[PDB]
Symmetry: C3
Subunit: 491 residues, 3 copies
């Protein structure tokens, strides 16, 4: 009237944070953690401390050949990836084609050193016109012009003698060399420009064995030209020579490019500003600081990125189901201001809440470990995802699509089920921990107290604060009080 | 002699349905659900309400060029995919080759609009023979013939003047244009057919810059011909023109094809009948209504399909382990005609079974949620799986094989383990629910009754049907009967 | 003073074996099993009882054409895969190129029958020089030589008459036929070697329609040659004929190869010895006997292999957490020499340990099943992983890299989490089993004994060895002793 009491219960708070489990939707929970990265800085950034190459209105092709309408950031000796607009305004001003263009973009996607040098001075053409090879298709300062890195040689007097030029790579580095051939409209234009009716370009390295022949066809006007310019490239190794021989139609190198190549990336399509930021994961929509194992921003990423997932939320439960003084069988304790599982007692020294420090710490460590495993076991590797295939490589582009879609399907399913399964394990863990605490006490107390059925015990003896501490410590001395207990019990 | 009683127990039935768990094989279970789709309608069907193009005995090539032995369904203005036989009987009647054939099949796999038009009338050839270009290799009504969409021009008198033809696409739609070149057996055949010993075909658009030259070689007879026909195609954009120039060996266009293209699919190899059905997933062996997240019919599918898996059964447990009146410790209750977990009682008003409605509903909802999650979290995307690579693309075909086999291995393993793990969770859930019910009662009753050890309690007081209902409701008033209980108890 | 006793407890041993769970790191455990294969025999082995083709210092190209510096194992009529060194010393002694080289390596990766035959005897050249076609680039026994399978025909007197040669495949098997063209340095060398200034090679089968023309360019010296040799191949079906016609520059077949092809593999890069072993999984670093579902040796494997994983250990718990006489609440029993869960008793016949055979067997079966499922559900398929793409196929090689890296990421994550999740299930299973045993006893004994709170019961009646056996058997007859029990109890 009334006997001392100890109750077992668990933390409750004012959290409205919701979680899903394999078995229940929308469970209110004490604390939760999202493992889905959803935020980007809306900028293009350095990748592992190397600037990108941003081409504002120029194709890689326009940029390499010196399309004179390309007004770009000129000096840039290395880069980590390339940014183009979807459809650049300035490509090949004089219409035509670039041989193995996509393989060259991929080779140039990431470059350790890039330095333009002069391999054949425009001034070295003594028996051909170096300054007439100009077109209204390729306008400069209002006046007719041409690609600036490459020379459109025309006949001098009414003669086009055979060109023989060798260039020996005396540099330490590989040379990217560019040249072209003019496909004229007819035999009259052919002889008007090059005098000789039948022409070739021969090009030889230790590797290359090329002979080009112009092709006449009747073609639609593009940039007001029915002629076509076709471009070719090789990499000249650092002690090899390249040998040019031509009768006509030769678009000669003036400038070539020293390159050092240490691994590739790809070409990103984006309309974003550079932002001086560093990042380890770039997206067409912005960069990401990628601690989280999953993201939903954009598939077309370059770097060490979270796995891309079709998903709005991946929220793990970290806390508990959230809902005399009665114990656990009737709900949680707002009063348990600290601790996850613990006790409420009332004796002649007064009443209050005490955390079970040991079971609380064990459980916090467990849940922290669960979250860190799900994050830290994720293998993160460098990859570069772009669209590098042309409109006659549609079968290969379909192969890439099935693979990308394939991985999106596997990761989206596994992350969703992983969160549902583990959330159910976590909430069941909390129930298992509370019930085990109740049993820890029930087994110490035996017949020295009575189970009240609500998660509380009423003692058959005086249990001061020091007795209570021994119950919470698991050091309760049953023999010490069996005598006093038995007297009140038999009555 | 004898006291009132309440027992805790669970549903049992005459089910022989079996399930596997990570830990036990062949567990008999009250109710189970298969999540593996194994059934197909054995027919080719519309895909999202668009008919397929079924070519009974004709290659795409034979069909486009008008191989005169192709007796096909002529009119068909759109389609969702193409069906060919493994080795069609009718391909190129006059032997030869089709340039970038596989890329053209892929472009044509799915078409929004397809309409054949006449771009160059057979009657427009005033200075060349339009009706002699015929062969015994390409038989029609017993008589020698040729591809019907394309004209094999021969010299007239003993002259083959230079052809110059332009066609301007004044249509709203892209044009697929087809032409070819004849590779004759020798210089005598060359001049016998075309008079001129040295010939070319030049073709130009805003894109195309082609010059073809016939090739003599001594070749094996195919369909009794040692000559070869080589075919080329372009897509002419809706305000461009195509310009043809030829000296000889020209297989001229007569008919071209207006096309509208909105996304691709692939070419399916099947010997099935069309069936007027609609479907969202087509298989070479038949269509599928794809609610289930997995299937085992065939890898080579087109549409939004379940994931393909090497597996005969993926069966989830939905019910319970299946096996006075004693309670749960001795087995299940055939008498529990309704409910999963509940009670049996016996008092002076009589005996019977009562379902624990709350715990039963919670558990049914849980298991329904588990099944729906495993089904509904599956990301389903459109894909088209075929074999689109030629016998010099074997490395790329091996790349595709490793990817396909890769995904089959991941999905087959994850589905099998998913079912084994969750089956074990489900059966352990049922045990956890029954035991918690027993405890719900034990904690209400305390010393007002005695545990019989078999899942039953014997009351120390009269418990009429209204007392029993309060035990099942969790509203049992222990104080109301402690007095009566204690008297019978002390004795 | 003192009463008979029965205790519930579990096995403990001197194991230091450690395991991880989703929630705890470094749990000491009674017994564990690694499912990650980490061991290889450091040798190249037969694959499913078929020898490899090991090329010690020769390229496939060098080997097929008979580079005279290739000192290889000559006779070898079938093989399962090919082994090359990263950069073979002996390739094309006379510099040049091999057309569709990579597709030919892939075709030859695995061969059922391979037999070199003579299709055109060197002695059959009556109007051309068959023994002058020799070079200092291709040295033999100190003296100038050439590829041995193919004849470099030179003019005789000062004449190079037109070659016309047919070979009809009268063999039962497909023929791999090889030929080439010489690209000389200039018009003087052209006529010095072949007399005719303007030359061609025409080659025709039922399939092939080729016309080759030599190409002059000024080229860097390689093996002291500025000339180039370009090689071509076809597969001649078993009743077709191949027809050669040439004016000059013809590198003629002498020897061709009968082949039978039944499925492909790839080319492995390794510096290992053959070892007479058989295997179902070969690695560049050594073979594997692949019972385990995962391995971490090397990605570039051929056969039916475990899944490749970035991981040092995948260790499953199979045993228990490892740590009067007290029962389970105070730790494990070194004394439980046999069994997982069981009992300790003490009566007037003496004291000792007894295994709960039924619950122990159920648990051993469960854990054995868990391990076997995780191993046996793994779909294992034949695959061949190599690097088969050239330096202008870098985009496709990047496609293959993303796929390979993709599968490594999926398998590494799923195996790591699978082991963490199941380890937690296994340890929780053991706790659930021990606690259920304690309850099995508590429910049989009821008030005929008292719970001591440490996992032990003290009996209120004499419990001889035969009573004890009935408690362990679940056949304990409570009524038989309630009388004796109640007397000692009321006191
Ligand atoms: C869960 O919560 C949200 C409210 O934020 C609601 O939209 C949804 O309908 C709820 N229930 C289910 C079954 O998803
Ligand atoms: C071209 O150059 C000069 C005339 O300026 C003259 O010496 C030369 O012969 C001219 N050639 C011809 C063929 O007119
Ligand atoms: C280029 O110059 C170097 C250094 O003078 C020389 O050794 C080398 O042979 C030259 N390269 C060629 C292909 O001639
Ligand atoms: C637990 O509580 C008792 C009583 O307050 C105290 O004396 C003892 O030091 C504690 N025991 C342990 C092991 O912490
Ligand atoms: C399980 O059930 C089937 C009978 O339908 C039987 O074939 C199989 O052998 C049984 N046991 C095991 C271990 O698979
Ligand atoms: C061919 O056409 C007619 C003869 O029918 C004639 O006017 C023409 O000159 C003929 N040509 C030759 C060269 O025979
Ligand atoms: C085709 O006709 C249109 C309309 O007459 C014209 O504007 C267009 O320029 C023509 N196309 C070409 C390439 O000439
Ligand atoms: C439960 O049972 C009692 C006795 O039949 C009834 O009076 C009461 O309305 C019920 N209580 C609830 C909360 O359903
Ligand atoms: C676990 O065990 C190993 C000792 O073998 C140790 O290196 C490691 O630091 C321990 N703890 C954790 C948290 O990994
Ligand atoms: C080459 O062969 C012999 C000389 O040995 C002779 O009959 C033949 O005419 C020679 N040809 C020429 C054109 O010298
Ligand atoms: C090759 O010889 C066979 C048998 O004599 C013959 O039937 C076949 O037609 C020949 N092949 C060719 C293409 O001539
Ligand atoms: C169990 O133990 C009792 C007493 O030793 C023995 O008589 C009986 O045969 C056993 N019962 C069973 C079912 O094994």
């Amino acid at each position: 009237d009334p006997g001392d009491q100890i109750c077992i219960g668990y933390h409750a708070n004012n959290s409205t944070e919701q979680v899903d489990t394999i078995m229940e939707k929308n469970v209110t929970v004490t604390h939760a953690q999202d493992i889905l990265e959803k935020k980007h800085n809306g900028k293009l950034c350095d990748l592992d401390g190397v600037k990108p190459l941003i081409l504002r209105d120029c194709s890689v092709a326009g940029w390499l050949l010196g399309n004179p309408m390309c007004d770009e950031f000129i000096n840039v000796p290395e880069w980590s990836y390339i940014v183009e607009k979807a459809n650049p305004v300035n490509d090949l001003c004089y219409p035509g084609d670039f041989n193995d263009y996509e393989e060259l973009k991929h080779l140039l996607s990431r470059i350790n050193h890039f330095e333009k040098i002069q391999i054949i001075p425009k001034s070295s053409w003594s028996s051909h016109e170096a300054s007439l090879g100009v077109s209204s298709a390729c306008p400069y300062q209002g006046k007719s012009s041409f690609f600036r890195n490459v020379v459109w040689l025309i006949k001098k007097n009414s003669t086009y003698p055979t060109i023989k030029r060798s260039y020996n790579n005396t540099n330490q580095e590989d040379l990217l060399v560019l040249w072209g051939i003019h496909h004229p409209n007819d035999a009259a234009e052919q002889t008007k420009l090059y005098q000789n009716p039948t022409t070739y370009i021969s090009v030889g390295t230790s590797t290359l064995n090329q002979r080009l022949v112009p092709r006449i066809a009747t073609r639609s006007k593009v940039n007001g030209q029915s002629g076509r310019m076709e471009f070719f490239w090789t990499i000249l190794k650092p002690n090899d020579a390249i040998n040019f021989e031509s009768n006509g139609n030769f678009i000669a190198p003036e400038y070539a490019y020293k390159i050092v190549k240490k691994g590739d990336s790809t070409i990103m399509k984006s309309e974003l500003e550079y932002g001086n930021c560093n990042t380890k994961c770039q997206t067409p929509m912005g960069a990401i600081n990628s601690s989280m194992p999953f993201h939903n921003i954009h598939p077309l990423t370059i770097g060490e990125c979270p796995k891309y997932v079709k998903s709005n939320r991946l929220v793990l439960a970290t806390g508990l189901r959230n809902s005399a003084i009665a114990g656990f069988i009737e709900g949680g304790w707002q009063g348990m201001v600290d601790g996850w599982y613990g006790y409420h007692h009332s004796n002649e020294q007064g009443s209050g809440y005490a955390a079970d420090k040991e079971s609380t710490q064990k459980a916090i460590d467990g849940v922290t470990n669960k979250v860190n495993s799900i994050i830290d076991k994720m293998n993160t590797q460098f990859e570069a995802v772009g669209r590098e295939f042309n409109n006659l490589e549609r079968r290969i582009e379909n192969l890439n699509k099935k693979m990308e879609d394939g991985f999106l399907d596997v990761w989206t399913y596994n992350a969703e089920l992983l969160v549902l399964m583990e959330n159910e394990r976590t909430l069941d863990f909390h129930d298992s921990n509370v019930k085990n605490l109740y049993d820890k006490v029930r087994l110490q107390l035996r017949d020295n107290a009575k189970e009240l059925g609500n998660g509380c015990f009423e003692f058959y003896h005086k249990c001061d604060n020091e007795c209570m501490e021994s119950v919470r410590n698991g050091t309760y001395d049953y023999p010490q009080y069996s005598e006093e207990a038995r007297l009140k019990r038999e009555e």
